[PDB]
DNA sequence: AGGATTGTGCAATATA
DNA sequence: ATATTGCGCAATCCTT
């Protein structure tokens, strides 16, 4: 129907359920496009300290030359 | 009105790229994750890249340091 | 008995 | 003009 309080009552709740759900949906959609952020600055991070690394290493093992 | 040959125009329009709109969306979605997999393996890589050489460099260090002067 | 999910389409708004 | 976004609805699924 259109006019029964039961009916009324009926839509309320479920516009605040289907409000609250696609929330949520749109909430984990953004948390996963985040995520690619953080681990793409968390590996060029990552990548930095191995060059680093070996240029420590390299310039230690130079040593043994002189 | 809304019974108008215009607005029935306008409307089946806007379904057919509200339609789009959101399966370009829902795809986007996917490849995000497909690259959230990707980035993790890389990562793990990354880090198993760092400890070897952290350990590797530790004990070259050590090494040096029993030195005498 | 009542919330969560979803195919679908209206409408407002943003954009070109 | 199309693209994007929020939302209502009703059917449906799931909880209590």
Redesign the interface.
Known sequence: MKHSDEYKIRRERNNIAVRKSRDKAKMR?LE??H??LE??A??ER??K??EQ??R??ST??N?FKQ
Do not use: A, C, D, F
């Open positions: 959609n996963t496009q995520k690619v681990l793409t968390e590996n990552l990548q300290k191995v690394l070996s420590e290493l230690l093992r040593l």
